[PDB]
């Protein structure tokens, strides 16, 4: 499994989509993170 | 810019996307005390660029 990043792709022969699987919590903070403001104040 | 605004400046009051950089003021009120032990507030001004 590896990371195609750039330009758009088309999966070849013997090529399928792999999930990345996250640890509890960390899902909740990276999309808080985008402007988690008065979180960080309080 | 999560910024502070209000009486005795609460913080988080204030949301702003630009910074301001102009020749003003924000007052606060002040709750001291004296060495008499007389405790008495205060109303300020504080002139800042």
Known sequence: VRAVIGSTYMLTQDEVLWEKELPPGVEELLNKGQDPLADRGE | ?49
């Open chain 2, 1 to 49: 810019l999560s910024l502070s605004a209000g009486r005795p400046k609460r913080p988080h009051a204030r949301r702003a996307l630009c910074l301001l950089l102009g020749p003003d003021f924000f007052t606060d009120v002040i709750t001291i005390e004296t060495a008499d032990h007389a405790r008495l507030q205060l109303q300020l001004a504080y002139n800042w660029h």
